[PDB]
Scaffold this active site. Structure first.
Site, PDB file in Angstrom:
ATOM      1  CG  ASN A  33      -5.627   3.724  20.136  1.00 49.35           C
ATOM      2  OD1 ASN A  33      -6.766   3.416  20.493  1.00 49.35           O
ATOM      3  ND2 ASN A  33      -5.077   3.264  19.015  1.00 49.35           N
ATOM      4  CG  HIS A  88     -10.815   2.787  17.731  1.00 50.94           C
ATOM      5  ND1 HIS A  88     -11.143   1.802  18.637  1.00 50.94           N
ATOM      6  CD2 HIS A  88      -9.648   3.321  18.163  1.00 50.94           C
ATOM      7  CE1 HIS A  88     -10.214   1.738  19.571  1.00 50.94           C
ATOM      8  NE2 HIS A  88      -9.297   2.651  19.312  1.00 50.94           N
ATOM      9  CB  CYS A 129     -12.905   1.805  21.660  1.00 55.53           C
ATOM     10  SG  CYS A 129     -14.238   1.865  20.438  1.00 55.53           S
TER      11      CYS A 129
HETATM   12  C1  LIG Z   1     -14.622   0.258  19.696  1.00 51.56           C
HETATM   13  C2  LIG Z   1     -13.496  -0.819  19.807  1.00 51.56           C
HETATM   14  O1  LIG Z   1     -12.733  -0.940  18.875  1.00 51.56           O
HETATM   15  O2  LIG Z   1     -13.454  -1.452  20.851  1.00 51.56           O
HETATM   16  C3  LIG Z   1     -15.934  -0.416  19.293  1.00 51.56           C
HETATM   17  O3  LIG Z   1     -15.840  -1.071  18.056  1.00 51.56           O
HETATM   18  C4  LIG Z   1     -17.159   0.495  19.184  1.00 51.56           C
HETATM   19  O4  LIG Z   1     -17.605   1.087  20.148  1.00 51.56           O
HETATM   20  N1  LIG Z   1     -17.644   0.549  17.916  1.00 51.56           N
HETATM   21  C5  LIG Z   1     -18.763   1.350  17.647  1.00 51.56           C
HETATM   22  C6  LIG Z   1     -18.523   2.552  16.731  1.00 51.56           C
HETATM   23  C7  LIG Z   1     -18.569   3.840  17.642  1.00 51.56           C
HETATM   24  C8  LIG Z   1     -17.153   4.232  18.129  1.00 51.56           C
HETATM   25  C9  LIG Z   1     -19.108   5.013  16.781  1.00 51.56           C
HETATM   26  C10 LIG Z   1     -19.889   0.461  17.165  1.00 51.56           C
HETATM   27  O5  LIG Z   1     -19.735  -0.125  16.108  1.00 51.56           O
HETATM   28  N2  LIG Z   1     -21.015   0.307  17.895  1.00 51.56           N
HETATM   29  C11 LIG Z   1     -22.307   0.756  17.387  1.00 51.56           C
HETATM   30  C12 LIG Z   1     -23.149  -0.541  17.176  1.00 51.56           C
HETATM   31  C13 LIG Z   1     -23.293  -1.530  18.378  1.00 51.56           C
HETATM   32  C14 LIG Z   1     -23.598  -2.957  17.878  1.00 51.56           C
HETATM   33  C15 LIG Z   1     -24.506  -1.010  19.280  1.00 51.56           C
END
Ligand SMILES: *[C@@H](C(=O)O)[C@H](O)C(=O)N[C@@H](CC(C)C)C(=O)NCCC(C)C
Length: 251
Positions: free
Chosen positions: A217, A197, A29
């Site tokens: 989305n 997300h 995302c």
């Molecule tokens: C988005 C998706 O649902 O595909 C994906 O989960 C994502 O990019 N999540 C990040 C949160 C941001 C939108 C703020 C996320 O958790 N990544 C940060 C940590 C990673 C392991 C570097």
């Protein structure tokens, strides 16, 4: 600033603004909110219709953006755009652009003719070449951004940014009661948190006295309201106003 605003109607010559993509079984995302908004802006500040490759962002940014299908940092994606640029690339199996998306579409918490999504999908390789038959070469098809910035957690400033420069990327906390969204203005009332997300904000409005943000989305068109949803605006509701990132294309 007007009480309502739809980028889809304010920029009729920019079709990407109304298209909804599908991230497939991959936590990409962060890359979608970015390439979608970037595509819109390339069209808005050069009036050329081009679908920026989500594949290029997700696979070639590296640690600067996070961990591929494991999630990333939105503002990092816009940074990569200004540093290395992005090639074109359409939907999965579309054969459009330098690098079309390689991850198959799926059903995101809804029933359909597509396979259900299964969060387990690996990050494709960073292949610096375009699909066979495409021109120019990978290097020559790079679209560069000329600035990458962060919009303040401020309703008026966010509205102003979109109003003048087009859709922006944002992120919010998804809770289980959001998965079943269909219409109206979403408001979290119950359910455990699923995680952050990243999405694309293209406008705002008011529905029965309830102010909201018009959001796109990346879970295909059979989810929510044709792929879009509306969420409460003005209260940093579930963090919708806390992580706004955007940027401008080189002329
Ligand atoms: C988005 C998706 O649902 O595909 C994906 O989960 C994502 O990019 N999540 C990040 C949160 C941001 C939108 C703020 C996320 O958790 N990544 C940060 C940590 C990673 C392991 C570097």
């Amino acid at each position: 600033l007007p009480e309502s605003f739809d980028a889809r109607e304010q920029w009729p010559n920019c079709p990407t603004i109304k298209e909804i993509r599908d991230q497939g079984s991959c936590g990409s995302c962060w890359a979608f909110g970015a390439v979608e908004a970037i595509s819109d802006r390339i069209c808005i500040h050069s009036n050329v219709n081009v679908e920026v490759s989500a594949e290029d962002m997700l696979t070639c940014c590296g640690g600067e953006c996070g961990d591929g299908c494991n999630g990333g940092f939105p503002s990092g994606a816009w940074n990569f755009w200004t540093k290395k640029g992005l090639v074109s690339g359409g939907l999965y199996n579309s054969h459009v652009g330098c690098r079309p998306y390689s991850i198959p579409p799926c059903e995101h918490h809804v029933n359909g003719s597509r396979p259900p999504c299964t969060g387990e999908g690996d990050t494709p390789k960073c292949s610096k070449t375009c699909e066979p038959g495409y021109s120019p070469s990978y290097k020559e098809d790079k679209h560069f951004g000329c600035s990458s910035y962060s919009v303040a957690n401020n309703e008026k400033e966010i509205m102003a940014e979109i109003y003048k420069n087009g859709p922006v990327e944002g992120a919010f906390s998804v809770y289980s009661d959001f998965l079943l969204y269909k219409s109206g203005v979403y408001q979290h009332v119950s359910g455990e948190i699923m995680g952050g997300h990243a999405i694309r904000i293209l406008g705002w409005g008011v529905e029965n006295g309830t102010p909201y943000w018009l959001v796109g989305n990346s879970w295909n068109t059979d989810w929510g309201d044709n792929g879009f949803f509306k969420i409460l605006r003005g209260q940093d509701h579930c963090g919708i106003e806390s992580e706004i990132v955007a940027g401008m294309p080189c002329t």
